[PDB]
Specification:
heterotrimer, A: about 10% strand, rod-shaped, B: mainly beta, 12 strands, Transcriptional enhancer factor TEF-3 (chain B)
Chain lengths: ~50, ~210, ~190
Amino acid sequence: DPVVEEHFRRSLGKNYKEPEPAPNSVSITGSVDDHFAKALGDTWLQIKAA
Amino acid sequence: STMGRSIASSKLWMLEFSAFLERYNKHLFVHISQSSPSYSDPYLETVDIRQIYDKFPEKKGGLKELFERGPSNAFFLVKFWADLNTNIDDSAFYGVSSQYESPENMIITCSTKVCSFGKQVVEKVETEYARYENGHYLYRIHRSPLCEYMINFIHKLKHLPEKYMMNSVLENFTILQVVTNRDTQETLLCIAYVFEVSASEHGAQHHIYRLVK
Amino acid sequence: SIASSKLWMLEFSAFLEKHLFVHISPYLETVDIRQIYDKFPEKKGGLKELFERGPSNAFFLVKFWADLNTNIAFYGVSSQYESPENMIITCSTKVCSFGKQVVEKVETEYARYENGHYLYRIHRSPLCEYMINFIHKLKHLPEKYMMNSVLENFTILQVVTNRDTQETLLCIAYVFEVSASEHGAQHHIYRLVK
């Protein structure tokens, strides 16, 4: 409840436990496909085409 | 309506956005700040979204389908004129910071897909809860770290000899940003960014558009 | 078991909704960490640099033998850790293709105090689009020798960190194969050394 949270945040200052603390994220920098091609070569390319 | 005068849908509004370089030194590459919906600014100009499908990943997760489903008043195009003129990073933190507002209390997912020639190169997914403060539900992505791809891109770009060369590189560089309600899966706002270098010596500019049809 | 001075993993599981792909619930054999550096990102933030800073009693390698034999849906992973100290932890897990990072998931957790210890729980946290797609394409390959070929250079670096002190509490390196059995998964834990 963010409206309750506000009261607490304001009351405790540096003793306030952030209810959902940072950091959080999911970073994706790659293609599953590219991996299979690298592991399986032509064999993978043949399967994709069906 | 108040709708259509800022980057704001019925459920979510963008208040602040920036990409920056820190070292104490700071450099803004790109900056935007808005207010809550109101009657103070005129309607945004429009842009036909079909002119832009080709610049973002299509197929399934794509922009066309995204537009066709979620409310079309949630869709915006920002043209950036980035400021690439800084001599730091010679130490340096590359970050992005944004802030949003809701009338409602919800949990939002921010997904940022960087795109090269319309194919995705990286994706960042962030989940933000609402802090409550006076009347407002605020959401903050504060000093979120840029990926190695983006740092490298900006570095190689920063050091080009000509701005017309910089614009050619940026020509096929785009960022699709879709913000989503984690429960309802409703898209709260979806912003498409296109890019150029600032003509100015210093400073960045932007121009906001509503995406239509 | 997988334990340093400040943190130990009690449970880890990857699942499909239930089907277990991979599950966990001294005198561990060892592995020379210099032999696996190439299997994880090697520059700054690299396993080598990580080892040299953080406590060497925090580093582990787990070999999994996945159970890919299911036709079931939510894809999730759940793990739980235990500490004597009360702290704020960040769990960073990087998926790696041929030693290059392809996804990184960063999670930050508090402890509930329960029995003698502070417990941390990552409960039913959802796999990214990449991993679902991976397991999907992996699962549906016509042969197990093909599957192991794909898994050969598929690895996950999991580094758990005290968010305030920046100290590393445990670091686990996973390597993979498909289970030889029709059903069931297995695992084998190693201490990473030197």
